Symmetry: D3
Subunit: 174 residues, 6 copies
């Protein structure tokens, strides 16, 4: 299932995201297991906080933290866990956590998939309230898990996101 | 996953349907990808209209439009996206669209799976309001997608549905 | 998908459960098909009663009734159908039904997965109201399916559950 | 609020029902308090069983058990708790419980309110599965509440329902 | 309840809306009855189409069609039926229907109530996709109700909305 | 509606709570308006965080902050907004905020209303994870509202809660 999904049709700008956690879903963290082909319950979020947007990853990538590149996907309705969406980048949230330096990409679907998000051209177009909610979420969601912490550094743009994707694809292939 | 699901236990009357879109689900069109083994987000429905009944397809079939035979499955509660249900035909909705002549089968589960639908013996037994809602849905759901259109021609019965299934199974096998 | 999920990381006490039916889900019984890699609609529950806790099975097991060992998993929020959760046993509900002697294990997730259930150390710690609801459910849910019946015998503890798991793993391997 | 809602526009055949418990709602029994003008939590259903159809009462009535006449209202989608629906009778379920002889009317909305239920002309038109689910519900829902019990006697028709309504209206007015 | 809610704190620009139908709610049309103080089920929408945004009215107003001024309220999450929200106008949708000339105001909450909508300053700021969905909804939702019809004429701005409100308040007071 | 609900049947230990915000509801803060008899949208929570348990107030009370005594009510399923529940105290969360010293009572329903919570005899019986989630919620939910802040001081017991209730009832009556 998940192991054979291509990273993208035209990398780094046209990529695929496998959704693990739908926007506003009950506060349970799922992770795709490529060895099993199934979603695995990773943990119940200690704070009970919910992801404000859909969350997943780009298959066939390997980031600096040893996991695939993570992506937040903004949509008008939450997406199905375990589904795949063709996406494009808006920017990224830069942070550091227990696993090391971490970044989360921010994306929306391909314009033909989601005409509703077509006017979001970069992270600057995302409403301030939603960016603030995403930052707050990452700063606070691990507050009740011992030995885990998150410091948010700031936002970066589409170019930074593309570098993350290209690096991830290359790292995966050895 | 989806690629190895048989078309049916006793074709054309006893067939399997892989569900893509649950009844009354939020207006997001998913499509099963047999190359990936996963549901893919095809598009956000422009009108925001929801499928009034469950929607999916019969695996190992190839219809005249180049896709597997499509099926609407009537149930008392919506079915899980990506699940498989053993079904029987009631009839079909005949239409034409941008891909060419299209028909949608109407089905219910096997009587042992869903005793609640056992007294629905043909499309004539389906309540008029629900048939009207299904027709309205197909006539209007693509109203905000440029270059797409649908003209509904009428309803046909179980014999027509069985022909669609037998043709689809044969076309698939070459 | 389901066919290659290990029975557990450290059997019988540290095992995996594939979820078929989320707690409080609409009253539709799904079963994982290892030949298809998908959930199949088994039946609409005649009484319309819902599982009061999540329900699934341990893969790579074969119980006395010819199916894998069944497990009820208690969680603060319902789990996704088709997901896998790392679990530990609290005890089991002993019963007899049309397939013969049947037992249902009662489990919670691994403490690192679900800190919320960490203080549930055995079936005696589960609230009386919930145990009573589970017993009532199994006694009554098949009341409107001809030729099916269930007599609940009583609860047993963690040792009994571990025997069921070890027996199931051995039976599966021949 | 509830105290001034008329029993009906043309009694006993054209009556109003104040909804207390929506179909398939979480298993919490609400009761309208005419002294407060609000819904009050009466009890959490011990068995966790849900009302299979909407449940409420006809205001300005007093039945033999000291409460207003109770009504089950069948609809395609659940109704809002505390809302009022114009309804017509299909029949009634006769039973006895701890409060004494009790009957529950079965109704659908006025045909102009709900065209979907217009072809339900009496209790004989209601699907057997749904009647069986309603009977099962009343026989079992109080199974875990000490000192409470229910014996279902059978179904009766529209004439019996009209007698219940006329008697209730008269009893209320002294 | 509803009869004593003021039309607004500072009319016509700062007004109150009583919500009848939450955004994306199941397709049941409720109407507030000021004589009863309760929501009444008006009808099940024949097409099964859902309001794409919250819908209600300004109390203590009387429009040209004999009902209070109607308002669509855009929010990030649907609002409770029967709740009251402090709102401001963005514009209005002009149409004609069976009751005569009708207009629907478009509004968002007061900026202190909903900071998320604060950057919506007029109807021109509302995304095109959402305006198109609202127009489509009103053009099509009555398609299966005999003798009812709707022709959409176009959008107008904040000044037109304010005129509707001032006229409505004056008409109500005699 | 709300203005005539008694503070309790036997104060301070047997009191009534009017629910404003159901557990896990979408992050919209409603407040009961006794002048209107309706729930009013107070604000959309800036952080998007949800109340982890039901939230409301005791009518006919006036606390030190100028509002009625606030109460968190723990239940197995969320309660309806605007409903009334007969409750008993477990303790209280002591804090300070922009309005001054504030305390939130913690309660469960009367044992006959909710047998499921009958073994919760004080705040010490509430699971640690849930107490931690409640504390986290109050510390963080106002993080994105300018000029608002919350410092949590600690938990207190049933005696402290009873003092809050008795003081509130007395303050209300002049
Ligand atoms: K490229
Ligand atoms: K055949
Ligand atoms: K072991
Ligand atoms: K009459
Ligand atoms: K003014
Ligand atoms: K007392
Ligand atoms: Na990561
Ligand atoms: Na097709
Ligand atoms: Na079994
Ligand atoms: Na009664
Ligand atoms: Na109007
Ligand atoms: Na307060």
């Amino acid at each position: 299932s998940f192991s054979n999904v291509p990273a993208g049709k035209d990398l780094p700008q046209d990529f695929n995201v496998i959704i693990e956690i739908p926007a506003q879903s009950e506060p349970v963290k799922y992770e795709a297991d490529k060895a099993l082909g199934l979603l695995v319950v990773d943990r119940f979020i200690g704070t009970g906080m919910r992801y404000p947007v859909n969350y997943g990853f780009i298959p066939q990538t390997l980031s600096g933290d040893g996991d695939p590149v993570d992506v937040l996907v903004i949509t008008p309705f939450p997406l199905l866990a375990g589904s795949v969406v063709r996406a494009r980048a808006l920017g990224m949230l830069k942070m550091t956590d227990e696993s090391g330096v971490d970044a989360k990409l921010v994306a929306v679907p391909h314009d033909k998939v989601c005409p509703m998000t077509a006017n979001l051209k970069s992270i600057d177009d995302v409403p301030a309230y939603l960016k603030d909610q995403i930052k707050h979420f990452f700063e606070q969601y691990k507050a009740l898990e011992k030995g885990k912490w998150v410091k948010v550094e700031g936002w970066d743009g589409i170019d930074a996101a593309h570098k993350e994707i290209t690096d991830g694809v290359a790292n995966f292939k050895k």
